[PDB]
Every structure is written in C-alpha cells, then in structure tokens.
Amino acid sequence: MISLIAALAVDRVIGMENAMPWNLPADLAWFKRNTLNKPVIMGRHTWESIGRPLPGRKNIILSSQPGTDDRVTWVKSVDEAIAACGDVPEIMVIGGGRVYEQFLPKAQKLYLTHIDAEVEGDTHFPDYEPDDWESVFSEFHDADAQNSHSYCFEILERR
Ligand SMILES: NC(=O)c1ccc[n+]([C@@H]2O[C@H](COP(=O)([O-])OP(=O)(O)OC[C@H]3O[C@@H](n4cnc5c(N)ncnc54)[C@H](OP(=O)(O)O)[C@@H]3O)[C@@H](O)[C@H]2O)c1
Ligand SMILES: Nc1nc(=O)c2nc(CNc3ccc(C(=O)N[C@@H](CCC(=O)O)C(=O)O)cc3)cnc2[nH]1
C-alpha cells in the first residue's frame, strides 16, 4: 500500500521558490502523526528542504544522481524507491511535485491538507479525478493564534 501526503493551497500549490507564506503547525503535527514509523519516499528537492532525515521514518530519496548522505537511502527510480521501503503496511510518499505525480497512479490513499491560502507557486499536487477517490475523513479547522490560515485535513481512499 502506497499513500501520498501533501499540503495544498489554492490551485493545488504545494511548492514555490521561497518558504510558504503561512504558519501551520497543526498541519505539521498531522504530517508527523500520519508518517511516523513508516517509510517516506521523497524527491531530492524535498530532501534538501527538510534538511535532515525525518526521525522515526525510513527515508528514501529519489535522485538520478549518486546519493550524498549515507543517513538515508538513495534510489534512481520509482520502482527502486518502493522496493527500498521493504515489506510494510504503508509507504508514505511525501513529495514533491514530480514524486507525487509518479506515485499517485500507484497510490491507494491520499492524506491532503487543503489550506485556504492564496499563493503563487511553481509546483502543484497532481490532478486526482475524484471518481477515483472516496473521501473517508474530513476535518476542517479555522485559523487560530497558532495557525495563520484555515485548513482541512482529508483522507481519500482509491476506488
Ligand atoms: N520549470 C519548473 O517549474 C521546474 C522543473 C523541474 C524542477 N523545478 C524546481 O524544483 C523545485 C521543487 O520541485 P519538486 O517539488 O518537483 O521536487 P521533488 O519532486 O522533491 O524532487 C525532484 C527531484 O527528485 C528526483 N526524482 C524525482 N523523480 C525521480 C525518478 N523517477 N527517478 C530519479 N530521480 C527522481 C530528481 O532528482 P535529481 O534532480 O537529483 O535527479 C528530481 O530533480 C521547484 O522550486 C521547481 O522550480 C522546476
Ligand atoms: N500535510 C503535509 N504538510 C506538510 O508540510 C508537508 N510537507 C511535505 C514536504 N516538506 C516537509 C518539510 C519539512 C518537514 C518536517 O521537518 N517535518 C518534521 C517536523 C519538524 C518541524 O517542525 O519542522 C517531522 O518530523 O515530520 C516535513 C515535510 C510533504 N507533505 C506534507 N504534508
């Protein structure tokens, strides 16, 4: 079982040149609880963004180039990424855009945070046709003193 997890603003924006213009510590907590003790596959740019291995997770990094950090596992293909996760109940694909695009057709679950933020970015979560996906969980949150925007956690499972 392969799952994708992603935080989407408007227009499914997930990434931009600079740090996202928001502070969403609840979404970070959601990402951690949904990824903890699972293998995480990410692309090299997301690996760079994160800065260090996600603790408590087997970290698998996709790059066409040789790896540059022996703390994590580097693979050169989608299939090698999956294989490098081993035999687990659930692989979490944590982005970014090129990685999500390649893993979405493989995935059985999506964990999406829909953030009510108007941002320009160069990177978008893929179109998922909702005839393919059933929303099994939905939880909306207003912005508050810790969270700059309203956001909604959703889990979809593939039909
Ligand atoms: N014109 C564009 O918009 C464009 C096009 C490409 C990239 N970018 C820039 O990259 C940033 C974020 O991109 P992202 O979120 O898409 O990054 P991402 O998915 O986190 O990382 C992408 C990197 O992962 C590796 N990768 C992904 N799939 C692979 C595969 N099947 N086999 C081998 N390696 C694989 C490649 O690493 P290596 O590079 O080490 O091979 C690729 O460059 C953006 O700020 C964006 O501007 C932009
Ligand atoms: N829902 C969701 N929110 C996200 O921010 C998110 N981010 C990514 C990719 N980028 C990142 C960047 C940093 C960390 C990160 O450092 N998380 C730490 C908590 C430490 C912190 O507070 O920064 C973790 O342990 O998961 C994770 C993913 C992928 N899916 C997402 N999914």
GROMACS .gro file of C-alpha atoms and ligand atoms in nm:
model
  239
    1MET     CA    1   0.000   0.000   0.000
    2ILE     CA    2   0.123   0.338  -0.113
    3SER     CA    3  -0.009   0.665   0.027
    4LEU     CA    4   0.070   1.026  -0.063
    5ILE     CA    5   0.061   1.304   0.195
    6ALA     CA    6   0.064   1.670   0.092
    7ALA     CA    7  -0.038   2.019   0.198
    8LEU     CA    8  -0.220   2.200  -0.082
    9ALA     CA    9  -0.305   2.566  -0.104
   10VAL     CA   10  -0.530   2.709  -0.377
   11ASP     CA   11  -0.469   2.573  -0.720
   12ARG     CA   12  -0.315   2.269  -0.551
   13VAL     CA   13   0.002   2.472  -0.496
   14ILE     CA   14   0.242   2.272  -0.282
   15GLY     CA   15   0.570   2.447  -0.353
   16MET     CA   16   0.730   2.772  -0.454
   17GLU     CA   17   1.073   2.939  -0.484
   18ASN     CA   18   1.060   3.061  -0.124
   19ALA     CA   19   0.920   2.933   0.207
   20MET     CA   20   0.544   2.914   0.214
   21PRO     CA   21   0.373   3.235   0.342
   22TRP     CA   22   0.197   3.067   0.629
   23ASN     CA   23   0.243   2.914   0.967
   24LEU     CA   24   0.054   2.588   1.009
   25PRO     CA   25   0.190   2.393   1.299
   26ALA     CA   26  -0.130   2.176   1.313
   27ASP     CA   27  -0.062   2.056   0.962
   28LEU     CA   28   0.294   1.971   1.063
   29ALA     CA   29   0.159   1.772   1.354
   30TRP     CA   30  -0.081   1.590   1.113
   31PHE     CA   31   0.209   1.514   0.875
   32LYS     CA   32   0.413   1.375   1.164
   33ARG     CA   33   0.138   1.157   1.309
   34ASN     CA   34   0.048   1.018   0.963
   35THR     CA   35   0.408   0.944   0.869
   36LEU     CA   36   0.556   0.825   1.192
   37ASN     CA   37   0.726   0.482   1.183
   38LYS     CA   38   0.654   0.450   0.813
   39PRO     CA   39   0.894   0.467   0.517
   40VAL     CA   40   0.885   0.806   0.346
   41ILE     CA   41   0.970   0.848  -0.019
   42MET     CA   42   1.065   1.196  -0.130
   43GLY     CA   43   1.240   1.361  -0.422
   44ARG     CA   44   1.577   1.523  -0.385
   45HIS     CA   45   1.442   1.879  -0.361
   46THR     CA   46   1.213   1.782  -0.073
   47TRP     CA   47   1.504   1.603   0.091
   48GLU     CA   48   1.703   1.926   0.064
   49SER     CA   49   1.405   2.125   0.201
   50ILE     CA   50   1.370   1.905   0.500
   51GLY     CA   51   1.742   1.933   0.586
   52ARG     CA   52   1.782   1.604   0.773
   53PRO     CA   53   1.623   1.268   0.789
   54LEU     CA   54   1.270   1.257   0.924
   55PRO     CA   55   1.322   1.087   1.256
   56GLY     CA   56   1.144   0.766   1.322
   57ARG     CA   57   1.100   0.701   0.942
   58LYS     CA   58   1.300   0.503   0.683
   59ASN     CA   59   1.389   0.792   0.443
   60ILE     CA   60   1.406   0.704   0.074
   61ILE     CA   61   1.523   0.977  -0.159
   62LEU     CA   62   1.482   0.971  -0.535
   63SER     CA   63   1.770   1.119  -0.744
   64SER     CA   64   1.910   1.036  -1.089
   65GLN     CA   65   2.249   1.123  -0.933
   66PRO     CA   66   2.451   0.933  -0.671
   67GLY     CA   67   2.343   0.992  -0.315
   68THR     CA   68   2.516   1.244  -0.097
   69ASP     CA   69   2.403   1.145   0.252
   70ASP     CA   70   2.457   0.799   0.393
   71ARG     CA   71   2.190   0.857   0.666
   72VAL     CA   72   1.922   0.788   0.407
   73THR     CA   73   1.861   0.557   0.115
   74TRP     CA   74   1.901   0.688  -0.239
   75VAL     CA   75   1.736   0.531  -0.539
   76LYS     CA   76   1.719   0.625  -0.903
   77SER     CA   77   1.374   0.508  -0.996
   78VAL     CA   78   1.020   0.493  -0.867
   79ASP     CA   79   1.034   0.114  -0.855
   80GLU     CA   80   1.359   0.109  -0.665
   81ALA     CA   81   1.208   0.356  -0.418
   82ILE     CA   82   0.918   0.121  -0.349
   83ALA     CA   83   1.147  -0.180  -0.328
   84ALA     CA   84   1.370   0.013  -0.083
   85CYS     CA   85   1.076   0.051   0.156
   86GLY     CA   86   1.063  -0.327   0.201
   87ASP     CA   87   0.760  -0.513   0.318
   88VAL     CA   88   0.547  -0.266   0.514
   89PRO     CA   89   0.183  -0.195   0.571
   90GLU     CA   90   0.201   0.160   0.423
   91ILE     CA   91   0.460   0.363   0.228
   92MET     CA   92   0.421   0.742   0.262
   93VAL     CA   93   0.515   0.948  -0.040
   94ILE     CA   94   0.592   1.293   0.088
   95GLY     CA   95   0.661   1.483  -0.233
   96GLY     CA   96   0.744   1.688  -0.406
   97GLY     CA   97   0.552   1.752  -0.720
   98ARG     CA   98   0.747   1.527  -0.961
   99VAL     CA   99   0.739   1.248  -0.699
  100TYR     CA  100   0.367   1.286  -0.624
  101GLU     CA  101   0.295   1.279  -0.999
  102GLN     CA  102   0.472   0.950  -1.048
  103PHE     CA  103   0.323   0.786  -0.731
  104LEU     CA  104  -0.039   0.898  -0.748
  105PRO     CA  105  -0.143   0.621  -1.000
  106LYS     CA  106   0.024   0.372  -0.765
  107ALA     CA  107  -0.142   0.500  -0.450
  108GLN     CA  108  -0.434   0.370  -0.257
  109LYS     CA  109  -0.465   0.656  -0.013
  110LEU     CA  110  -0.420   1.030  -0.008
  111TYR     CA  111  -0.371   1.242   0.305
  112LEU     CA  112  -0.430   1.604   0.193
  113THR     CA  113  -0.440   1.920   0.390
  114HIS     CA  114  -0.636   2.185   0.199
  115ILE     CA  115  -0.510   2.520   0.313
  116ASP     CA  116  -0.722   2.834   0.245
  117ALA     CA  117  -0.422   3.038   0.130
  118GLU     CA  118  -0.382   3.229  -0.194
  119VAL     CA  119  -0.021   3.170  -0.305
  120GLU     CA  120   0.173   3.158  -0.625
  121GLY     CA  121   0.391   2.855  -0.668
  122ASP     CA  122   0.570   2.660  -0.932
  123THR     CA  123   0.475   2.316  -0.802
  124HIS     CA  124   0.127   2.158  -0.771
  125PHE     CA  125  -0.019   1.840  -0.638
  126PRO     CA  126  -0.139   1.627  -0.932
  127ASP     CA  127  -0.499   1.625  -1.051
  128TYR     CA  128  -0.669   1.335  -0.885
  129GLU     CA  129  -1.002   1.258  -1.056
  130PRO     CA  130  -1.249   1.233  -0.764
  131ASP     CA  131  -1.437   0.947  -0.936
  132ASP     CA  132  -1.121   0.753  -0.847
  133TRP     CA  133  -1.118   0.860  -0.486
  134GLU     CA  134  -1.352   0.838  -0.194
  135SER     CA  135  -1.321   1.083   0.089
  136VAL     CA  136  -1.324   0.879   0.405
  137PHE     CA  137  -1.223   1.153   0.652
  138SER     CA  138  -1.258   1.528   0.651
  139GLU     CA  139  -1.179   1.769   0.936
  140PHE     CA  140  -1.190   2.148   0.898
  141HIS     CA  141  -1.010   2.393   1.121
  142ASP     CA  142  -1.035   2.770   1.143
  143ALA     CA  143  -0.711   2.972   1.170
  144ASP     CA  144  -0.624   3.047   1.523
  145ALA     CA  145  -0.344   3.205   1.727
  146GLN     CA  146  -0.101   2.928   1.615
  147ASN     CA  147  -0.234   2.876   1.260
  148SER     CA  148  -0.226   3.157   1.000
  149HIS     CA  149  -0.498   3.015   0.770
  150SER     CA  150  -0.794   2.775   0.785
  151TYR     CA  151  -0.712   2.428   0.671
  152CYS     CA  152  -0.891   2.096   0.623
  153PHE     CA  153  -0.742   1.752   0.667
  154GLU     CA  154  -0.883   1.493   0.426
  155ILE     CA  155  -0.813   1.126   0.364
  156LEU     CA  156  -0.920   0.969   0.041
  157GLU     CA  157  -0.904   0.601  -0.048
  158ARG     CA  158  -0.884   0.481  -0.402
  159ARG     CA  159  -1.197   0.332  -0.554
  160LIG     N1  160   1.032   2.478  -1.461
  160LIG     C1  161   0.994   2.417  -1.350
  160LIG     O1  162   0.893   2.455  -1.290
  160LIG     C2  163   1.077   2.305  -1.290
  160LIG     C3  164   1.116   2.182  -1.345
  160LIG     C4  165   1.194   2.095  -1.266
  160LIG     C5  166   1.231   2.132  -1.135
  160LIG     N2  167   1.191   2.252  -1.084
  160LIG     C6  168   1.218   2.306  -0.948
  160LIG     O2  169   1.229   2.214  -0.838
  160LIG     C7  170   1.159   2.265  -0.720
  160LIG     C8  171   1.069   2.162  -0.649
  160LIG     O3  172   1.044   2.053  -0.736
  160LIG     P1  173   0.967   1.924  -0.681
  160LIG     O4  174   0.888   1.968  -0.566
  160LIG     O5  175   0.905   1.864  -0.802
  160LIG     O6  176   1.088   1.838  -0.621
  160LIG     P2  177   1.080   1.687  -0.573
  160LIG     O7  178   0.983   1.608  -0.651
  160LIG     O8  179   1.102   1.698  -0.427
  160LIG     O9  180   1.229   1.647  -0.620
  160LIG     C9  181   1.254   1.629  -0.758
  160LIG    C10  182   1.390   1.559  -0.775
  160LIG    O10  183   1.372   1.422  -0.733
  160LIG    C11  184   1.438   1.332  -0.819
  160LIG     N3  185   1.348   1.241  -0.884
  160LIG    C12  186   1.210   1.253  -0.885
  160LIG     N4  187   1.159   1.153  -0.952
  160LIG    C13  188   1.263   1.071  -0.992
  160LIG    C14  189   1.276   0.944  -1.065
  160LIG     N5  190   1.169   0.879  -1.111
  160LIG     N6  191   1.398   0.891  -1.080
  160LIG    C15  192   1.508   0.955  -1.033
  160LIG     N7  193   1.506   1.071  -0.969
  160LIG    C16  194   1.387   1.129  -0.942
  160LIG    C17  195   1.518   1.420  -0.916
  160LIG    O11  196   1.643   1.446  -0.850
  160LIG     P3  197   1.779   1.486  -0.930
  160LIG    O12  198   1.749   1.625  -0.975
  160LIG    O13  199   1.886   1.472  -0.826
  160LIG    O14  200   1.778   1.387  -1.041
  160LIG    C18  201   1.433   1.547  -0.920
  160LIG    O15  202   1.507   1.660  -0.960
  160LIG    C19  203   1.074   2.383  -0.762
  160LIG    O16  204   1.108   2.503  -0.689
  160LIG    C20  205   1.095   2.391  -0.912
  160LIG    O17  206   1.104   2.525  -0.962
  160LIG    C21  207   1.118   2.333  -1.162
  161LIG     N1  208   0.027   1.770   0.531
  161LIG     C1  209   0.151   1.800   0.493
  161LIG     N2  210   0.213   1.912   0.541
  161LIG     C2  211   0.339   1.938   0.507
  161LIG     O1  212   0.402   2.040   0.543
  161LIG     C3  213   0.408   1.851   0.417
  161LIG     N3  214   0.537   1.881   0.378
  161LIG     C4  215   0.593   1.790   0.294
  161LIG     C5  216   0.736   1.810   0.243
  161LIG     N4  217   0.818   1.901   0.322
  161LIG     C6  218   0.845   1.881   0.453
  161LIG     C7  219   0.925   1.976   0.514
  161LIG     C8  220   0.960   1.962   0.648
  161LIG     C9  221   0.911   1.853   0.723
  161LIG    C10  222   0.947   1.842   0.868
  161LIG     O2  223   1.053   1.887   0.910
  161LIG     N5  224   0.863   1.777   0.949
  161LIG    C11  225   0.909   1.730   1.079
  161LIG    C12  226   0.872   1.824   1.195
  161LIG    C13  227   0.985   1.923   1.228
  161LIG    C14  228   0.936   2.065   1.208
  161LIG     O3  229   0.857   2.111   1.293
  161LIG     O4  230   0.975   2.129   1.107
  161LIG    C15  231   0.861   1.589   1.101
  161LIG     O5  232   0.911   1.525   1.196
  161LIG     O6  233   0.775   1.536   1.027
  161LIG    C16  234   0.832   1.757   0.661
  161LIG    C17  235   0.798   1.770   0.528
  161LIG    C18  236   0.520   1.680   0.249
  161LIG     N6  237   0.396   1.652   0.282
  161LIG    C19  238   0.333   1.738   0.364
  161LIG     N7  239   0.211   1.715   0.406
   0.00000   0.00000   0.00000
